[PDB]
């Protein structure tokens, strides 16, 4: 329960469970599957 | 959540251990790809690794010292510390500045805690029951000139009254003009051969002017006001390389000359352990 | 008047407490958010990116050669490099993974170690990356290294090898700071057969070593890092 | 069903580049460039889209990779602000928006050895060589097609060129967090990095503010075979895409 | 719950009073097995005999003394008590250490209370309105060297600000790497002929560095900080023999030479009452 | 502003109050629990285990013989041993049951006292364990001891006897510290007929005495024990 | 007695905090409101009115 | 009612009514019934 | 939730979303449409 009206008072959001490390680990145009030759 | 899957001997043409880093991709190779692994579970969520917790814990980010005394005969008050003002910057303390610089853009509503402690090294029979007025100064608000200026009314300037030792707690929504703070600004405020680089509108959030409003006692009470800050509603983008060299300025990535090595040299050749 | 009783520790300022707060800017509206690429939600997403390791950490000053592992041709049953697995110290202290780990006291999971060959394309060489779990000394020969977890690397069209250091520990979490009880082991590389260079080529060839965390990596108990310092509050 | 992942062709406007030993193109943060949607615009003037006139491969002056070269750094759109009509659309307005498709070229035989680090550093605010509280002067960070040669001598107002510290106080080994690609002479000779518009605002100035910076840092030293020339040409080709400009204005006045 | 069941004269071949302790089993022989008992009820639940209450009450487990004064000219500050640090150990106070050692493994989230009192034996006109900063130091966190070190920012190190006399109250989830604390560790951290026995990763939880952040008054205020601890979410395994000899060290069951007898000798022969 | 009124005693630190607390380690995750044998939920579970009593508490220093009750052959109508039932003092002060009881001020229930014969197998002997409720002096003869609660022990194939000391008290709970009003009584053992040893055997045979609590045992009102001491805060 | 814990910054006077307050004038009744023309609800309504600019600012 | 989100703040569990002293009093392989001969 | 009975204690009303700048910008008798001649 909040005691104030404006959003500056609300508490933190906790944790963002929506993870997606692909944008940083595999920022490649063509799809690369584990095991298959990276270049062919 | 499964941590490691069960995998036995592997004799196939698919080599998950061989790749080409020239593509710039990091293949998510797991332990089951190189050895024989058993079924294990994570038993871990990662709540403390989120940017909201990594950057969202209260910490000291600035400090100053002032006095409350008989101010008679001090023409230059502010420069004599009858009240001191500090430009809001999250880049003056290094242990939080580095965590903030780990990314290029950060959006957050802030939380401030102003810690003042009363003290008297010189002869003083007691420590007054002070009432500190903390004031927010937006760009344009009259940068006060004296401890008794026409500004302390605080009609539009936010003010918080409180006694020394106890702290104020006010929240600030994200006050940037962009969608986040420009942790790195590879750009100038305008096109001039004499303008400052990096430090621009995105950097200046105003300033905090510290004072006491109580009329003076019989002695100098040198007050040191330490400021604490927690980040709220933290969102991060464009992760960057960790800070290696220290800082000398605010908002500038400039470093000193002949800086000391950061890599721990080995004891012996490369083959030593 | 609602009767209340102040519990011990009332009015204290805890540097980790996350509570509500009244705002001094009423009716303010935060800027509408826009789309910015590369949003980071958790450090476990960025820590899995490969970063060069200063494996050749034997120079007087910091140089680009620190990340270049020298290789010598016509070398049989010889060591390439050797390093402990204290990710919070040594060669890993400066890497992105090590920098992120130093902000925490406990770490767990498997590490991803990769080597990339940069010599001539007409060159041939076979290397064996060997991981020595804790409890045993660092391997002093190839026959002792090959007894533990090892991956034979055949250098060919595939220029990069990816050897995942498996999590082999009794305790669920190891300490990030160098500790004897929570030692991660040792990592070394040896010449499998030899390094053969093509004609008209001389000198040494270099390997680029990468370190990245697996999706099963864990971190907790944040702490202050010792990689940055300050003794004078900053002015413009 | 037989094809190859190293044979790639990129056609933009009237320019076409061909390659047979290219690595999987890197899309920075898995976000392709897109036009600014109305839901985020803050300026009121309508944007002009010189789609075909400016979105083409502009080849920059090639660099000489020697055994002692430290690296090279380019700023965008600064690197293309003197290139045809793109430079005029960049100057005659107060702001601009456009993506970039970087294409680095470095070919060699199967006997050469070396590795180049092609990395895109968004908001690469460089460090000055004088320390203390010195600034870096606009006249240097905005070279143009010249770029910044990290092996030359420092001049008053140009940032420091210590390639080890990435000219900003960060170690070279940590630049891999950014979208990058290695040009390994044994495996790859041409790198490709599609760079979208990265900024905290929907639109920002394009003359005083450079969104991204391209760097080519040789990691492994160039080891040419016995009797060969100890030099290899590095040609950088950048192609704008999804270009936008707002507020056609009296020419932007830069020094010189 | 029934305490004692009704039982009359017993003349049978089943002898519940005769057994063989060589088997290691304790037969639950009741009073109704040896005499004639009446129907009685328990009227007792045993809520205060649970491990959660036996070990889960706040108590003092460590203490130190420090000062807040003009620190000018004191090269070695920490060793001069300008700030003191204590390695977290539940084995420094004996009346709680024994209760904790009654078992081999204990898992608990902790509760800490840091009690500081202001005092001035020497000439001092008043007792300042102090604001004590209590700081948690995880393994690796920079063990501060001076009262004004770059650590007190507390960006990742937990900090709690509060005035002397009043106490902080922060909870700590179970920070062990195992599923419990190794109350007994019949094992070494590693295989070396010069390593320490027992005291290992399981024992070191960090340390608590005590100080005051207020700038000095005109006199030495020798502060004694007493630390109190309550155990929460207590779970116990492998009950052990009660502690008989006292301690000399932390985490070690080592005792002194010529220790005093613990069994109360009789007054007379074995037949005396 | 919610009107409140601070009741007397606000801000006090009570060493027994169990209230909530804000944590300085947000988003931390305690290790996933594993199965560990021998989990203790209540002290009433472990206090019911038999432990040797130092009944022969007549030595100058502590010795293993303190738990050995000496027996002599050819002894008729003679006492074996005698002891009060102050479980928080005397011979029981050092036993597990006594150590657990000393942590509490009040105790109730029945006690389980057992003796195990360790002499030769070809030996025969009959003993009578007699419990004397409070109010009467300690039995000075066998005829006076046998009037109260007693159990005749026939030593044979069964080497252990289990005599449960019945709860015989007016008040519901007795004090753990030796007190006259809450005295538990006396416990003694006597030779029923005699101790007969087989040929070629001499010396004394010994009994092992055990003490354990019944499932109807009770404890409350925790208190600080006097069996451990300290005068110098501990360092490594 | 409802157990409470005073958070940091208790008893401070913030010049922007809008909270409740007990009144020293109980049972008072504010005057019944009447219709007054030109009511201003937001400054964005009055700021849109044209005003002369001192453009000839050279006196 | 709790005032905080993380489990470090919750109160004690009270009492664990699930008791089983058999694991400590009768940790024997074969079952031993009261009254019957312990060894036969 | 309010803790007092009289209206002097209630909190502020927040924001009056009912806006009408016409009374200040176009306080004219005859209607004037944008684009059409102001005077004819």
XYZ file of C-alpha atoms in Angstrom, chain B residues 79-215:
137
model
C 32.749 31.546 0.206
C 33.217 31.717 3.994
C 30.870 28.699 4.335
C 28.003 30.562 6.000
C 26.205 28.454 3.409
C 27.642 26.104 0.794
C 26.133 24.949 -2.498
C 26.951 21.766 -4.433
C 26.110 21.045 -8.075
C 24.289 17.709 -8.206
C 26.655 15.186 -9.756
C 26.722 11.396 -9.491
C 30.360 11.450 -10.646
C 32.190 12.771 -7.552
C 32.353 9.473 -5.615
C 34.159 6.715 -7.476
C 32.702 3.502 -6.036
C 29.241 4.511 -7.268
C 30.447 6.509 -10.275
C 31.998 3.394 -11.804
C 28.794 1.382 -11.382
C 26.873 4.232 -13.014
C 29.409 4.490 -15.867
C 29.167 0.754 -16.590
C 26.318 1.784 -18.932
C 25.820 4.593 -21.438
C 22.253 5.589 -20.493
C 20.535 5.409 -17.096
C 17.020 6.569 -16.161
C 16.110 6.804 -12.483
C 14.101 8.697 -9.929
C 16.453 9.559 -7.090
C 16.415 9.340 -3.295
C 18.555 11.698 -1.212
C 19.636 11.619 2.432
C 21.480 14.642 3.844
C 23.573 13.717 6.893
C 24.689 16.579 9.152
C 26.448 16.097 12.498
C 27.019 18.727 15.184
C 30.483 19.092 16.680
C 32.678 21.533 18.598
C 36.463 21.006 18.722
C 36.905 24.472 20.262
C 35.557 25.474 23.672
C 31.792 24.967 23.486
C 29.617 23.935 26.419
C 26.964 22.175 24.313
C 25.858 21.166 20.812
C 22.880 23.259 19.713
C 19.495 21.843 18.679
C 19.951 22.876 15.069
C 17.289 22.999 12.357
C 18.947 22.600 8.955
C 17.180 23.935 5.866
C 18.042 21.898 2.754
C 17.098 23.569 -0.528
C 16.852 22.384 -4.136
C 17.945 24.901 -6.785
C 16.612 24.335 -10.338
C 18.426 25.936 -13.291
C 17.567 29.629 -13.068
C 16.535 29.686 -9.411
C 18.446 32.513 -7.730
C 21.781 31.058 -6.671
C 21.727 32.526 -3.151
C 24.493 34.950 -2.179
C 24.117 35.213 1.620
C 22.859 32.979 4.416
C 19.881 35.387 4.746
C 19.132 35.912 1.062
C 15.706 36.444 -0.501
C 15.836 32.831 -1.729
C 15.366 30.850 1.484
C 11.623 31.593 1.328
C 11.565 28.534 -0.954
C 8.214 29.386 -2.524
C 9.156 27.579 -5.746
C 12.505 26.211 -4.573
C 11.937 22.968 -2.626
C 12.926 23.246 1.023
C 13.232 20.617 3.752
C 13.602 21.585 7.413
C 15.152 19.146 9.879
C 17.534 19.011 12.824
C 21.222 18.117 12.563
C 21.952 14.411 12.907
C 18.576 13.442 11.486
C 18.196 13.352 7.717
C 15.691 14.441 5.086
C 14.108 11.992 2.657
C 12.641 13.458 -0.535
C 12.145 11.686 -3.850
C 12.956 13.215 -7.234
C 11.401 11.961 -10.495
C 13.772 11.627 -13.432
C 14.741 15.238 -14.159
C 16.574 14.661 -17.437
C 15.464 16.154 -20.730
C 16.331 12.951 -22.591
C 14.963 9.495 -21.800
C 18.002 8.837 -19.581
C 21.197 10.329 -18.216
C 23.987 10.623 -20.784
C 26.605 8.603 -18.912
C 28.737 9.170 -22.011
C 28.111 12.192 -24.236
C 30.407 12.033 -27.281
C 29.129 15.446 -28.247
C 29.254 19.132 -27.426
C 26.539 21.438 -26.127
C 27.027 23.643 -29.203
C 29.479 24.324 -32.033
C 32.200 26.588 -30.649
C 35.985 26.323 -30.504
C 35.873 27.279 -26.799
C 32.964 25.257 -25.380
C 33.202 22.515 -22.773
C 33.022 18.884 -23.876
C 30.605 16.431 -22.284
C 29.397 18.658 -19.452
C 26.160 20.073 -20.869
C 22.446 20.411 -20.110
C 22.238 16.654 -19.521
C 24.779 16.990 -16.700
C 23.555 20.065 -14.788
C 20.614 19.114 -12.569
C 20.783 22.252 -10.414
C 22.518 22.352 -7.038
C 21.928 21.838 -3.315
C 22.661 24.774 -1.007
C 23.261 23.823 2.631
C 22.787 26.099 5.643
C 21.302 26.477 9.106
C 18.499 28.939 9.822
C 18.878 29.217 13.605
C 20.424 32.443 14.849
